[PDB]
Design a protein around this ligand. Structure first.
Ligand SMILES: Nc1nc(Oc2ccc(NC(=O)N[C@@H](CCc3ccccc3)C(=O)O)cc2)c2cc[nH]c2n1
Length: 274
């Protein structure tokens, strides 16, 4: 149950792009904060396309269930604006944006320790979700937000958060699902209702591949028909050039969902690289 924010208290600024049936804007929220102090707070605004209003339930159910669990590695949702014909998610604005964009622009200055630290943090967030038996369902580098850059001057590591999952793959059209191979697992291509905790272990593997690959998209050279055939022939992703996490990636991207390792075991493996 989300706090309702008045349209009057939001200003829309620049477009930040679009997601699946959504438009993204940087914005500002006027609000009374602690001690009654007035604030104008930078916010991330996620607007459901007016033409796809039928998706609003899934749009908001995702963000809602995760926002019931507070955690340092999970994005903060302030509330929702449902004034007028709008369906707007009002979210904390993370200073350095999405991880995939960040990896591409910083490819030639991100070392293995940075990748391992970000992987550990992501695994911590997924461990927390697994303990709470809560499925994310759309783990990917675009849904990882970089709160803070690494600072070698103080040894401060980077700090990331996992964003909301957006519209569930259980209600999206099959062609969007096919294009999201290989983040969407084989069993969910076979049947979207196979969405399960084991889904998030597979997509975590794909996300590690992104992190280790300077933001390349795995299988981007394959069209949708060939992505399906990739799964039909039981292929695995190539090892990234920085190959240190390749075995972990493949262990997570196991075609047998019951064989995919728990996030506790994943965390132990990450720690053993040191
Ligand atoms: N909290 C927040 N936020 C931001 O900006 C985002 C907007 C949207 C998203 N999240 C998505 O864009 N999610 C996609 C996923 C699509 C997908 C998933 C798996 C495989 C293929 C494709 C979607 O829903 O379409 C992430 C960051 C920014 C940008 C600067 N600062 C920010 N702070």
């Amino acid at each position: 149950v989300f706090h309702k924010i008045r349209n009057e208290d939001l200003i829309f600024n620049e477009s930040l792009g679009q997601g699946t049936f959504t438009k993204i804007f940087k914005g500002v929220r006027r609000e009374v904060g602690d001690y009654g102090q007035l604030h104008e707070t930078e916010v991330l605004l996620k607007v459901l396309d007016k033409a796809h209003r039928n998706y609003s339930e899934s749009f908001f159910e995702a963000a809602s269930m995760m926002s019931k669990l507070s955690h340092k590695h999970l994005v903060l949702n302030y509330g929702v604006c449902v004034c007028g014909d709008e369906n707007i998610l009002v979210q904390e604005f993370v200073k350095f944006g999405s991880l995939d964009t960040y990896l591409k622009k910083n490819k030639n200055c991100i070392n293995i320790l940075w990748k391992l630290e970000v992987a550990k943090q992501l695994a911590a967030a997924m461990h927390f979700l697994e303990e709470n038996t809560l499925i994310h369902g759309n783990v990917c580098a675009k849904n990882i937000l970089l709160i803070r850059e690494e600072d070698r001057k103080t040894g401060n590591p980077p700090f990331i958060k996992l964003s909301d999952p957006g519209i569930s793959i259980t209600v999206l059209p099959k062609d969007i699902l096919q294009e999201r191979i290989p983040w969407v697992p084989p069993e969910c291509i076979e049947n979207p209702k196979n969405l399960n905790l084991a889904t998030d272990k597979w997509s975590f593997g794909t996300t590690l591949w992104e992190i280790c690959s300077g933001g390349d998209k795995p299988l981007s050279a394959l069209d949708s028909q060939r992505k399906l055939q990739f799964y039909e022939d039981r292929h695995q992703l190539p090892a990234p050039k920085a190959a240190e996490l390749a075995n972990l990636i493949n262990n997570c991207m196991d075609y047998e969902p019951d064989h995919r390792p728990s996030f506790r075991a994943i965390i132990r493996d990450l720690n053993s690289l040191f």
